[PDB]
Assembly symmetry: C3
Homo-oligomer: 155 residues x 3
């Protein structure tokens, strides 16, 4: 019928405009504290928290902590850390089994970028190191979970 | 007709993807300076202003100052204030009638969370207190409108 | 057919809600570091960079540096600069031909708002001035490109 065809065409135009406007506002949103990789979005709050508090903040916000599963994802995190000039906590811990770092689902690492000599589980006055921080250069260091580091969430 | 049915199906897929992407970017946007409650969105600019300047900033931005009409809305504001560690101005004033706080539409309060002893209209050197600040604990204190407090806007 | 008509009506409702939600999240996004003018969106990162670094940051983010082509666009930039209280770099340089400022496409200025006495190409210890900064009052001053100024990107 002629009426619905005109309706479909109008909808087609509205959808196209929504898509154009959404791509623009996606880039506006991510500037400068976010990075998109595939269907994942990394964003920093610009503040520092302990691992447990960061875990609460990310969950509360409807997301989770960053789990870099590829060089592309890790490099995206590196950019955020570099911009804030503050090392960030990742999602992974070896809390269940020492030396065995896993995602918050128990799954073993599919990607790793340990700095030379890490993980060493030597946090000095803070004690054992069961969490992971990412440096501006993208490299990882195991770090005490009670330490304060940049919060990056994953949505 | 077969042509338009295929068009509707394609539109259905585009809309579904837009909805999925929009829910994700809603949470990305609100992290960490925004809170959604029903159809209302609270967001802080991270800066402090006098009541009048805050009123101008929120209006200019296409919104208004925060009018917590329920415990849920008030608690959302509490989280933002807690995160910034800065008490924020609300929208309500008793400027027309002393002791009678109203929304910027003249409507009386449907919800209130006054701290013990408030409102007292005693601002010391600033004079009368005709505006309202919200504490990290969610409680309210009547405050001089010329004082500087965190700006939270409502959209 | 009755089935597709109901589908079109449902799509109509979904699109309308998407549009309503998108206008709200557009204003939420732009508060307080963005300004919309026509189909262009200006946003500041809140940080300072040299012209070349700012050019890299904006490009990386999927946009470009601000090219105010009208009083409306320039005034929007003025508001962002005023809010951050930091003068920002614009996109234009006279690097190809001295005294002739052009957009990063070689096109001559369609709009200009030089402060009295500018451009003068006198940056003192920094040397020649081949870039442009915008003041809180909206006026322009030619500035050395190696100086650090507020980064505003255009999307
Ligand atoms: C740290 O602690 C971690 C937590 O315990 C632990 O993680 C575990 O790591 C192992 C080894 O990598 C891993 O096993 C692999 O799992 C792969 C994914 O599929 C899972 O899950 C799906 C369902 O989601 C199942 O359908 C799969 O069968 C498999 O089930 C797992 O099976 C094992 C027993 O076989 C159970 O113990 C797990 O509980 C169970 N997991 C789940 C979630 O159910 C899978 O693709 C891998 O397959 C390889 O091994 C199979 C035999 O196990 C072969 O049949 C298959 O062909 C694969 O062979 C590999 O092929 C390569 C070439 O292509 C060779 O180079 C490899 O050598 C060869 N590997 C082997 C072992 O033969 C594999 O099963 C567990 O999933 C994981 N556990 C959890 C809970 O995630 C770590 O080991 C600890 N150490 C470190 C350093 O991280
Ligand atoms: C501070 O200063 C404020 C500004 O002046 C002032 O705000 C006023 O507060 C009163 C009392 O709460 C409030 O009156 C209530 O209004 C309710 C909302 O409906 C309004 O508006 C709609 C249109 O939008 C009309 O259709 C309604 O009729 C009503 O109109 C109002 O009517 C009054 C006169 O009756 C006028 O003076 C107002 O100008 C006018 N407002 C507008 C915008 O037009 C309404 O639901 C409430 O209804 C109750 O009272 C009615 C009689 O007035 C009853 O018929 C009805 O059944 C309700 O009875 C209540 O029922 C409860 C149980 O269910 C009982 O427990 C209650 O005891 C009982 N209440 C009463 C009073 O009987 C009611 O009308 C005004 O709307 C509001 N004015 C403005 C401008 O917003 C405050 O009083 C000042 N003090 C404080 C402490 O805040
Ligand atoms: C700084 O350095 C800059 C870089 O070299 C330089 O920028 C150049 O500025 C000139 C003068 O303003 C400008 O010329 C104008 O271009 C207008 C836009 O159209 C362009 O491009 C389109 C395609 O995109 C073509 O279709 C047009 O023909 C025109 O092509 C240009 O043509 C000139 C030669 O004519 C070439 O040198 C350019 O390379 C070429 N550009 C491109 C991209 O291809 C155009 O609308 C303007 O038209 C006016 O002049 C025409 C004759 O050239 C007339 O036919 C037409 O009627 C217009 O007349 C004007 O009318 C007004 C009243 O309505 C009068 O008041 C004006 O006096 C009258 N102007 C003139 C000159 O007669 C015009 O062509 C160049 O486009 C631009 N170059 C580049 C690369 O961008 C600056 O001059 C330097 N100085 C300063 C201070 O900025
Ligand atoms: Ca450890
Ligand atoms: Ca270590
Ligand atoms: Ca008062
Ligand atoms: Ca008080
Ligand atoms: Ca120059
Ligand atoms: Ca100058």
């Amino acid at each position: 019928i002629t009426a619905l065809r005109q309706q479909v065409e109008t909808l087609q135009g509205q959808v196209q405009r929504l898509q154009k406007a959404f791509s623009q506002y996606k880039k506006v949103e991510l500037f400068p504290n976010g990075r998109g990789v595939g269907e994942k979005i990394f964003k920093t709050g610009g503040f520092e928290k302990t691992f447990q508090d960061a875990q609460q903040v990310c969950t509360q916000a409807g997301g989770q902590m960053a789990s870099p599963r590829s060089e592309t994802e890790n490099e995206a995190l590196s950019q955020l850390v570099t911009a804030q000039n503050k090392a960030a906590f990742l999602s992974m811990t070896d809390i269940k089994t020492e030396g065995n770092f896993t995602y918050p689902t128990g799954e073993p690492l599919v990607y790793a970028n340990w700095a030379p000599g890490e993980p060493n589980n030597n946090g000095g006055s803070s004690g054992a190191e069961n969490c992971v921080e990412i440096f501006p250069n993208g490299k990882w260091n195991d770090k005490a979970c009670g330490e304060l580091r940049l919060v990056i969430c994953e949505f």
